[PDB]
Amino acid sequence: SSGRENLYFQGMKSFQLVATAASGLEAIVGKEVARLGYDPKVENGKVYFEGDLSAIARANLWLRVADRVKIVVGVFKATTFDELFEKTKALPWEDYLPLDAQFPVAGKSVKSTLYSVPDCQAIVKKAIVNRVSEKYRRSGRLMETGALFKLEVSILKDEVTLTIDTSGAGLHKRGYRLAQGSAPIKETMAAALVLLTSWHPDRPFYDPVCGSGTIPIEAALIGQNIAPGFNREFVSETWDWMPKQVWADARQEAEDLANYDQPLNIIGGDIDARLIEIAKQNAVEAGLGDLITFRQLQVADFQTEDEYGVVVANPPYGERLEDEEAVRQLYREMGIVYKRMPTWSVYVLTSYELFEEVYGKKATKKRKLYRTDLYQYWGP
């Protein structure tokens, strides 16, 4: 993180990395990449940075708002498949892919002469096989049986970016919600919401419509400076050219930087007792024991003597009449309750158009996200 180490100690090998992100969340990912001591270049849905083996480990462990961390193998222009072929085979694929690499190729194409994704997939695969076959001298040992190097060819305005996935499962899958679907807020979005607030763990936190507990869990992990990826694995741990010691060092660092003694006052409320039991279990799996206070709690029944807290909510919103009426009632009740809490700040992520009207006051700030809006009521 100092950024000052001689590059010799990481094998004299530097990588062009990228941390992908939802559109509109890249600035936050940039700040997280800077936090790790790297130099971010923020673009639409992508934060590029240079790094070594340790950067791969540390970014996978630590980024909370990124979708995945990839290696950028190369970037060039191509308007014919023969040009895509040659420029792809010119890259040093053998530096990344061992004899037994498994290397499937995914594709994306937008506003490009080369429009056919299946043809781009085919030609990139052709070229990579050509390259490794040449550089391993047509070894009979070349076979796709071992570690996984998921490749992507992405073409935008005739510019080709070739990447290798270092993460495996998307980073939103921290491990604490497995086998529970994706109806709730995406974990990366939940972390983004908390990071867009003023909240610090010295202050109370409340998610009044918490469901299975994602927002409180992400807040707790921020509050104790716990790496989001601490309890999961990454595909790049299986790559023979990345030493296990790099990952062991990154994980020891993550343990050392955590603040497990930071007290937390975090309440998650939901009307569904079964989802509250699920939330408690998810928090145990996240390594948070019973630090979070999950309650079966209707919005209208919340009372506190605590001051200077932060409410953060993202109520599930179905756009049909019954579901919309239930959320209107929720927003109205929130407004009534939080009026009694003038020292608190309130953040509500919703696509319900009449939120401000129903809550009863206009927001301090309205941040547009992906279409949903983050309504922010800044407190003292």
Alpha helices in 139-268 (DSSP H): 187-196, 214-223, 244-257
| Same-domain check for residues 233 and 354 | no
Sign of CA dihedral 87, 92, 93, 94: positive
Alpha carbon distances (Å) from 262 to 226, 250, 289: 11, 22, 14
Quote the CA–CA distance of 66 and 176 in Å, as a whole number. Answer: 17
The alpha carbon torsion through 96, 67, 270, 224 (nearest 10 deg) reads 70
Residue indicated by tokens 């495996």 = 168
Q: What residues make up the domain containing 58?
A: 1-171+227-257
In this structure, how many other beta carbons lie within 10 angstroms of the beta carbon of residue 304? 14
| Same-domain check for residues 181 and 157 | no
Which residue, 77, 102, 247, is CA-closest to 165? 102
- CATH number of the domain within which 38 lies: 3.30.2130.30
What is the biggest distance separating any 2 CA atoms in the chain, rounded to whole angstroms? 75
Quote the CA–CA distance of 348 and 209 in Å, as a whole number. Answer: 10
| Same-domain check for residues 239 and 279 | no
Quote the CA–CA distance of 277 and 266 in Å, as a whole number. Answer: 16
| Same-domain check for residues 207 and 320 | yes
Give per-residue burial for 93-128: e unless 16+ CB within 10 Å, then b. bbebbbbebebebebebeebebeeeeebbebbbbbb
Which residue, 279, 65, 358, 315, is CA-closest to 185? 315
| 269 close to 302: Cβ distance less than 8 angstroms | yes
Quote the CA–CA distance of 169 and 152 in Å, as a whole number. Answer: 15
What is the chain's length? 380
* Phi then psi dihedrals of residue 349, to 5 deg: -95, 115
Quote the CA–CA distance of 164 and 318 in Å, as a whole number. Answer: 37
Is residue 46 exposed (0-12), middle (13-18) or buried (19+ Cβ within 10 Å)? buried
Residue indicated by tokens 């997939």 = 121
| Same-domain check for residues 60 and 147 | yes
Read off the tokens for 323. Answer: 């579901």
Which residue, 266, 257, 279, is CA-closest to 199? 266
Strand, coil or helix: 235: helix
N-terminal to C-terminal alpha carbon distance within the chain: 34
Residue where a domain terminates, one of 257, 275, 301: 257
Quote the CA–CA distance of 223 and 15 in Å, as a whole number. Answer: 31
Quote the CA–CA distance of 263 and 260 in Å, as a whole number. Answer: 8
Read off the tokens for 266. Answer: 């975090």
In this structure, how many other beta carbons lie within 10 angstroms of the beta carbon of residue 169? 15
Strand, coil or helix: 241: coil
Strand, coil or helix: 83: helix
* Phi then psi dihedrals of residue 187, to 5 deg: -60, -35
Quote the CA–CA distance of 330 and 354 in Å, as a whole number. Answer: 12
| 378 close to 348: Cβ distance less than 8 angstroms | no
151-156 vs 105-110, strand pairing mode: parallel
Residue indicated by tokens 């996200």 = 369
Quote the CA–CA distance of 35 and 33 in Å, as a whole number. Answer: 5
Residue indicated by tokens 């993180």 = 1
| Same-domain check for residues 148 and 279 | no
Residue indicated by tokens 């992100």 = 21
- CATH number of the domain within which 361 lies: 3.40.50.150
Alpha carbon distances (Å) from 149 to 98, 127, 196: 10, 16, 34
Which amino acid, residue 336? I
- Residue 219 CB-half CA count within 13 A: 33
Quote the CA–CA distance of 293 and 357 in Å, as a whole number. Answer: 31
Quote the CA–CA distance of 86 and 156 in Å, as a whole number. Answer: 18
| Same-domain check for residues 85 and 39 | yes
| Same-domain check for residues 161 and 276 | no
Strand partners, 373: 350, 368
| 310 close to 264: Cβ distance less than 8 angstroms | no
Quote the CA–CA distance of 318 and 327 in Å, as a whole number. Answer: 9
Which residue, 102, 227, 78, is CA-closest to 153? 78
- Residue 358 CB-half CA count within 13 A: 18
The alpha carbon torsion through 104, 50, 236, 35 (nearest 10 deg) reads -130
Q: Which residues are CB-contacts of 12 (< 8 A; sequence separation ≥ 6)? A: none
| Same-domain check for residues 239 and 264 | no
| Same-domain check for residues 51 and 176 | no
Distance from chain centroid for Cα 224: 18
Sign of CA dihedral 216, 222, 226, 229: positive
Quote the CA–CA distance of 14 and 214 in Å, as a whole number. Answer: 36
Number of folded domains in the chain? 2
Distance from chain centroid for Cα 191: 8
Read off the tokens for 48. Answer: 């590029």
Is residue 246 exposed (0-12), middle (13-18) or buried (19+ Cβ within 10 Å)? buried
| Same-domain check for residues 142 and 248 | yes
| 331 close to 358: Cβ distance less than 8 angstroms | yes
| Same-domain check for residues 9 and 52 | yes
Read off the tokens for 23. Answer: 């559109």
Alpha helices in the chain (DSSP H): 26-35, 53-62, 81-89, 117-135, 187-196, 214-223, 244-257, 273-285, 321-338, 355-359
